[PDB]
Design a protein around this nucleic acid. Sequence first.
RNA 1: AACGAGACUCUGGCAUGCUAACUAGUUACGCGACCCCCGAGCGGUCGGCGUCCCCCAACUUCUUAGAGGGACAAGUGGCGUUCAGCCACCCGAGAUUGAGCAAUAACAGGUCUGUGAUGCCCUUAGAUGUCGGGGCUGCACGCGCGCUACACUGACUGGCUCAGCGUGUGCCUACCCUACGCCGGCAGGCGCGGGUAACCCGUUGAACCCCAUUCGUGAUGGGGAUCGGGGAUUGCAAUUAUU
Lengths: 191, 141, 68, 141, 104, 227
Amino acid sequence: TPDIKLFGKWSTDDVQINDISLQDYIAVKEKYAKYLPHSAGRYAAKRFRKAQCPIVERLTNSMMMHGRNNGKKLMTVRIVKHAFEIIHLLTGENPLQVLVNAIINSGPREDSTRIGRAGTVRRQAVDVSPLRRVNQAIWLLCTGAREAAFRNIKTIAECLADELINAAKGSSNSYAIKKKDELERVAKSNR
Amino acid sequence: PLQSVQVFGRKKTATAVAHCKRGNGLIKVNGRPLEMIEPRTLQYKLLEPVLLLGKERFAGVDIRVRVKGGGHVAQIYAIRQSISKALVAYYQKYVDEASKKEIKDILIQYDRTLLVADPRRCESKKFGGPGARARYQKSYR
Amino acid sequence: MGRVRTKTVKKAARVIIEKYYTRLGNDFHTNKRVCEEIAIIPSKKLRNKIAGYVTHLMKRIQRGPVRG
Amino acid sequence: VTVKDVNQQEFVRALAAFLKKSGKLKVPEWVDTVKLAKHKELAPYDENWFYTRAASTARHLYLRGGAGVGSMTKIYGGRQRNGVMPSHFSRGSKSVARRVLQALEGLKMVEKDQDWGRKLTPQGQRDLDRIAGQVAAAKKK
Amino acid sequence: AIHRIRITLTSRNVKSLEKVCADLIRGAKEKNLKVKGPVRMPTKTLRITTRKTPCGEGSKTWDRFQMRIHKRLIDLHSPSEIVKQITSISIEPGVEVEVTIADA
Amino acid sequence: MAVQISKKRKFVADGIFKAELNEFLTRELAEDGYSGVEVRVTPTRTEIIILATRTQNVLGEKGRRIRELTAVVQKRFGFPEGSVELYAEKVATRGLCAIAQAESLRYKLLGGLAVRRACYGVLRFIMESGAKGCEVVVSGKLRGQRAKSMKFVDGLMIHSGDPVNYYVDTAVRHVLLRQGVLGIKVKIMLPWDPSGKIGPKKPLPDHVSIVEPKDEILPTTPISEQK
RNA sequence: AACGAGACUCUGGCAUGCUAACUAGUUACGCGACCCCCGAGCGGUCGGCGUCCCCCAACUUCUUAGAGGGACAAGUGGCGUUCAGCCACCCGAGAUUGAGCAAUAACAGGUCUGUGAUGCCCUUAGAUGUCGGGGCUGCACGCGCGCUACACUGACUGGCUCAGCGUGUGCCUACCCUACGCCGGCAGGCGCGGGUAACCCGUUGAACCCCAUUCGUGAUGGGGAUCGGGGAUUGCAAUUAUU
């Protein structure tokens, strides 16, 4: 605590990665815990450089999309502070363990791609990197809250905290755990 | 005898000249408290060195800072970058090596441009685009 | 990346080592200042190159004989 | 205390109330028909907007070297949505600010001083810093 | 009497400018006129951004031209005679000079 | 007699005077081997140094022509009377003076002479006078009513980088005939690298050479020699 | 051996080293004045807040612009014929920050409406060379470049708070940028003053953003097309609506 930042109130201790596969691309607490998610603007100039930056920051980055929200990273952080707050009142946990489950449960195990034969569509099943899983899982759940709040009275904060619950405990009421299983259902067929 | 050493920080043309003058506590910026510098959501960030190093490093100085340039954001990184280096310079000049070498290891661990500066500034636009890379649409019919 | 040395460097680098073999060290900075005095290289960036190749040659000349 | 120390969102909301108690400010008749700037599309919701704006007037004079009716408008102006045309900045009303500053001057909290601008009276400067500590007395700074 | 006399130089060529300034600072300091150094003012950009194609056709192209002026001034305080004597002579290049009676 | 215009506008108006004159003269001194000017304002006086190769034809008998030229400028730009003072100058080394070489080729051609033998004759002169190399172009008609181009080239040339501003000069002159117009262009490369005037800078242009002196002796053996 | 490539020029990134500054600042007092006890103390003083005062003060970190230095695959570990080079790492600004310049030969490409550049042909007094009026904006339709939108990650109304590249009357023939005072809801009018410009406008007190009200999933207060009436400014003249 006096030598390692919390989050402004939320411990990064008592936080685990419960896979051996997806750690070393999920990290949040080795020394990478900080008061806020922000950077000086170094995040990528090498392929390995992407991995290092926190998961909580990565979530904030992929939250601002679709034209009108680009370049408004401070507005974005407002939504994240409410998210953890709502998650803690609503279920009562270290609200980061919610998020870590939500990411791990939404990442695909097998994926398909295209292959050109006879000028006609054929598909091939292939595997997926841990770095791919994390990138995909962060994409998918953020699309859910963006979609729901497009005509609902509910705010995006409320929608997003709901979306991490249904991902963290699979229940197929989320946009993520649905879309995960769609890909794998294809990957079984053409293989 | 009067002791006074000055430093600055920069990020994206936002200068922040933070003088460390002998005294006790009371860090300010523009003759205002740092507690009320105004986005007040990034309040944990400019406070970060002071909070992390403890307030007992800041017990032989009065620091005041003057700023100019940049936007609301880039100023925050400038004032942080200056106060970090200001503290260091005070130890570099009036106290021994092993005091400040310790302090250097702590800050540079979570380096975030506290003791260094980005070389990145805007690139110059050329014609045929509204941006430096982005181009106007091309039609064949 | 890239930055493969041109022939203008490799031509004069050989010459400068043949006639001022004694003056050479194996440090960058010393071999720079020698090239500055025994000749004039009309650019600054060009000077920083010709020194570095003169250095890199002088490493190999202290082994078996060079064929250039 | 100096007015620098405190929050400024709090400053105005106690200073506006202060004036209206003391019978201060002789207001214009037009105050219920007034758009308030060229770049607005509506009247204010507020029914005591005049009291609020006189607060913000006197504060800025404490900081900066003081300036006339023109400069006050430039500080207040914002963005103008021209509909189908792209937005641009523009300045608001003048004749409101010309009533504000003359109403303050009737109380002798400001006065036309030298160097092309009204400046705030020492009696005015007394009254600002007097209620500045009242803010800290209230909540707890 | 001894009047604060300002020798303004103005040019477009940094070599031609600077050496002529140096000459006047040597000759002044040689005679102990208590000369004050050059005050180099911001170099100003004339920009002209115009078409490269007459009778526009083909891919749309432009051309940036620029002229860089330079100003700098040396302040002397000494009798106006010996200044106006020595100033106007010993200038080789096309570089302008403007003498001022007083400014301070 | 005042005040005076902005410093920005001060340079523009000088440029307009420098340029207008330089095309005024070229339409009168074409046959006299014109080669340029060099203006200089001096204390309470104007100098206009009218560079041409043969000062003879410029001067005239009793200095008539120089008197015409001074009276023109005295009225045209509204100069204060008697301030204007002309001077002439002869250039030495005439084959580095591309402008004059091109405009001489013009009158050789317009005099009525073949193109190939004319191009060769001008070429060897500018090569002989000193020059790394040189080039001539003639674009337009000849031997029918479709156009062609005729290049005559010898020696070195450059085309790229910043050295183009120093180490070459280039000129263009139109010449008429009874059938259309013919374009002359002359491009000539300056040779100085050892020293002087100094005019163009001492380094070599395209491949920038390493200037290399040599010394290397020893006969040393140990001894003490008292002084 | 030569041209192009590269080299080169400009620009960005590294200087508490060098050079020097009331048309640039900082610091230091001398301060005296204002302010509140706001903190120790009492209000003084010490400390805090800016402004005037500032010098015959001190300095050049910040700002300005000049001379210089620095980066070379330099060092280390792999890899390569162990050559030319390539990959990782230390130091750190990593050997690519972005532009300018650019060969041979060609095109029936564009331009006679840039040219007092130009051939030939035509026309030249009932003129293809001058004043007045109209048109290039005329629409059952087809296509291209864009702008503004379809909302709650929002709109609306208040409050807070940050910037840079430039430009400006004394020019073309009649014309600039604007502070300040007064009058008007606004457009605007009127009285005075400065600026040849690191000097005056402008310590460019800009927007998104930030903070607090109001609206509530509704073609809604989202959207602002279409259209009626009225008020100003430019000009010799504003109708087919100049703004």
